[PDB]
């Protein structure tokens, strides 16, 4: 938010008055800039854990496992997976800065993580990615949960069929009318609601003769206009401070969620 | 007396764009809808296009859709027709024509009849547009 | 589209004799407001058209009283009480009920 | 008799363009599903109160209704407003009319005297279809909104929705408490429509892309 | 821009990074006024120079519309002893637009004219003529001894059941009763005829001689302006940032041809935020879309004053056609940095996957981020890689624990 | 907390004056309702495993 | 409201509303911060469960 413009745009008469409140606008701009930097930090922390961009091999011989839905779709302009495409479809005085990482770059990071997990599993996290057949990887992962390897190898086909059916069920459930993505839609709705409430507060007169600064500056002389402009300044400054405080609380909540997501990754 | 004076004719080649103009005087220009009509040589009349009094609503005939752009400037009492993408059949004399129905004067409290396009009231002198190799 | 026609294509009339020239339409020209939207234009040889009849029976201001017309639905006709020498020209009938405005093919009026 | 107004009688509160927005407004609207008095005037036209605003509706094949009368006493003692449409023109004037017991028009009638305002233009009533009107008189302005819609329901107002747009906006500034409709008759024997009174209500108006009101909510209904 | 960064940081040295120093706003190139083409002057003469003013109890109201109202002549006239305006300054009246201006004219005794103002009390304010608390208008009064004097025709209401609402008038003449008896048509016990005349003798005491007072009331909410000052309309201009004034609606923005389907009675259009975004020009009657003039934050990319004094400036969310090396970055078009087709690790972030850095005769470059080195894992259904060696890695991690205990 | 009642209960004059400040009361009610729902979410996610 | 007329009562009521609204805003902000703390504790409790 441009604090000077939001409180009073294209009116030096107010801008001179707004200086008497000191550095509130600088504080608000600094806080919003901190939140903005925090968002890029969160995205980097969650997604940028790969030291290299691992490519899935051209031949999908993963022992019956079918990752076509989760792996990148080559034909698309943006290289998102099928399930990623389903996910993406289902979700003044102030400006919205763009993310540092575009959706293409986040998709690239996700594809790198998928390729590393599929081809090398746990190893690329520890160091250089060490290839291993996917059957043997899932075999050890069975061995990690107290189930011997022969339990997997003796019924590998059933395991692969179950995994494929589960992925297909996820695809079907997500493509349906189900609202499973309500958690991200809540973030979007909260941001939109906060911005709309901030904008609507400009219509409030806060006891002034009119909510429009141009009306006050056209109708009244400077000494008579000043007392109304002061009321409008106080009201709009209070609204902007409330908005920035709410954004700080929401940013703390999102930071906690992003730390949890980074740990989960 | 109602005055309409077309302008902007001449000979041209197929494929380029051209502008016709119509001066207007002797009446309140901005409150009247305006029509463009043409008469190809040796054949009957053809309504080309109409523009609303404020320029908000524009309509054109089936033979000219997508191509022609009708516009006006109420300050200068002028009417225009941009003749984009010509072919031979556009060879015709062209008339700017007034609408019989002006819109209600809003300074009076009465807002009836609703503003509607009606036939051509007064026709201008006319100018010839020839397009051919 | 509201295609329209006029007959006869050319009517030859002695001076002073009454004249009758017809117009027709494919769809009814009566509008929901109750008005029947038909416009007629006279184009004498060598200038732009001139409006004569603006509603089916309403003559335009400045038109001589000899011009008159009537009709309903899809059949319309204009009557001239007595044809004078300046009445030579082409008569075009036109609907304004719907856009585009569609003219008839036009009909000539001449002296015998 | 009485009937139910199924969301009829909503109008554009102000002459400001709004498109693709849900606007919450406070104005004198007709409450949804309210009791509208149905008058079977043809086998009379009683003088009715003007409670801050009136919603008037009617539907006939022969356009018997032609105008309205407004005022307090409806006699020479006080200023009165007249609106009436004959076969060719409307006439609006504000005069100390000495109205008779049965105002109407013959095959044509007036009682004007000693007054200030007059106006003439094309008629908004013409020679199946429902004609709706809303009358207001506030802040010195007398206002009429109107909308015409085809119908097929015989003896009740339709379930559909249609907003009434302005038709008259005059700064007459007279005191109005009573009104009376007037009819056209083929006789002069001096001795059909629904009525509903507006109330202050908060409405939420949906403006579509073309600027027309397509739906509304009566916040106090339920 | 480097000095701007130094000034906003309040330090002579600047670290490597990107700093928002100021806000860019393209300035209005021209001033535009579009008032309605009303020619006739306003009949203020018959309001002030009337032959006779109504009594204060029955104050006469005139409606004023379709005017080029010149308030400078009224303001500069020496006749008016009291020229007091509440919701507007007298000097500004020659540049405002109003709808349906009222003029309430009546005659009144001298010293009690002070009761004619918002929130006042007293017999005239309470029981004869009251202004609203949020009154927007002017009260104009002057001596009228030479015209209204003796003379006893003018009256004022003394007795009345309750305080009047604003802008209502009482004409009743029935005998008011302060006593309990039914004083029907008779001045019984503590009962009086409500109206009694003023004693306007030709040489009555100071403050008792008659005063003629005219009160102008303005309405601003209604859309169509009917009374406007004698300003001169400027030629319209489009597609550039200008200060505009349509019927007193002051503003700044870019005017563009509108596709909105305004009805003929509609003059303004309102956005979802309930702010004016379209307007009908009051002379050409055409609808013009209003959009804000382009603006955005200004960010300075600095390699660090210890490194170099060269900097690059990012104008956020603007097109370089409006800004006055140049490069149209998606996060606002960037100047002072040269685009390079290579890709490197993000040194100084900008946005939309583009960063900047100071590199080789050196200059500030701008490039798309390289997420990492490409790697194709040699996966096969019967191939495994096993480490034959290891390296013990000690990596430091820093975590805040506490902060200073201020009080 | 009912914002209007807390700031001024049963006072229509103060209720009218409070509308001039806009949507502060709605904002505060929304925040408190969010906190209230969040408490139930906390108890659910802790105990409803 | 019983002592003063509307023009002066409004002047008093404006500052009274300002004070009470500021108090309510501070209360809601403190509650939001405390709710964030309690949510952190509840997430920890759910993880421990
Ligand atoms: C993998 O699943 C896709 C459907 O998502 C299917 O089209 C494809 O044939 C499958 N391939 C294998 C090898 O199972
Ligand atoms: C009022 O409306 C109710 C329900 O619509 C109806 O039952 C009742 O008869 C009506 N009464 C009058 C007096 O209109
Ligand atoms: C309006 O007229 C009514 C009579 O119907 C009367 O009782 C009332 O006092 C009048 N009000 C005004 C303000 O003239
Ligand atoms: C309609 O009334 C006007 C006066 O208001 C009159 O001039 C006109 O002749 C009338 N028309 C008919 C058909 O009675
Ligand atoms: C006209 O009306 C005015 C005001 O009501 C009245 O004073 C006058 O006597 C009336 N004149 C006639 C002729 O009715
Ligand atoms: C709006 O106007 C256009 C053009 O007249 C029309 O095609 C459309 O049906 C109207 N309604 C909507 C909802 O777009
Ligand atoms: C106003 O209207 C007159 C009508 O003759 C016209 O000449 C003039 O150009 C218009 N505009 C101005 C600014 O006077
Ligand atoms: C009233 O009369 C005086 C006489 O000189 C004149 O100057 C003035 O313009 C007139 N009108 C007003 C409103 O004062
Ligand atoms: C400037 O940077 C260089 C290289 O990082 C460093 O060696 C030097 O100490 C720095 N000087 C200052 C004054 O910071
Ligand atoms: C910048 O402006 C020019 C001219 O208006 C336009 O052609 C171009 O597409 C714009 N570019 C962007 C990214 O907005
Ligand atoms: C960089 O890429 C652009 C677009 O492909 C090309 O026009 C330009 O010549 C390239 N420059 C260099 C130095 O490779
Ligand atoms: C393992 O690496 C170390 C250096 O880190 C080297 O000294 C040692 O010889 C290596 N051992 C083998 C078996 O390669």
Numbering used by the authors:
A (entry chain B): 736 to 826, 856 to 1029
B (entry chain X): 1 to 52, 52A, 53 to 82, 82A, 82B, 82C, 83 to 100, 100A, ...
C (entry chain Y): 1 to 27, 27A, 27B, 27C, 27D, 27E, 28 to 107
D (entry chain B): 27 to 69, 80 to 143, 159 to 178, 187 to 250, 264 to 294
E (entry chain A): 295 to 443, 447 to 621, 641 to 676, 689 to 735
F (entry chain C): 736 to 784
G (entry chain C): 981 to 1029
Copy the relevant paper text.
Here, we report two genetically related human mAbs, 12-16 and 12-19, which blocked receptor binding and neutralized all SARS-CoV-2 variants or subvariants tested, with in vitro potency similar to some of the authorized antibodies. Interestingly, these mAbs did not target RBD but instead targeted a quaternary epitope formed by NTD and SD1. Antibody binding to this site locked the RBD in the “down” position, uncovering a mechanism for receptor interference and virus neutralization. To determine molecular interactions of 12-16 and 12-19 with spike protein, we employed cryoelectron microscopy (cryo-EM) to visualize Fab fragments of each antibody in complex with S2P-prefusion-stabilized SARS-CoV-2 WA1 spike protein.
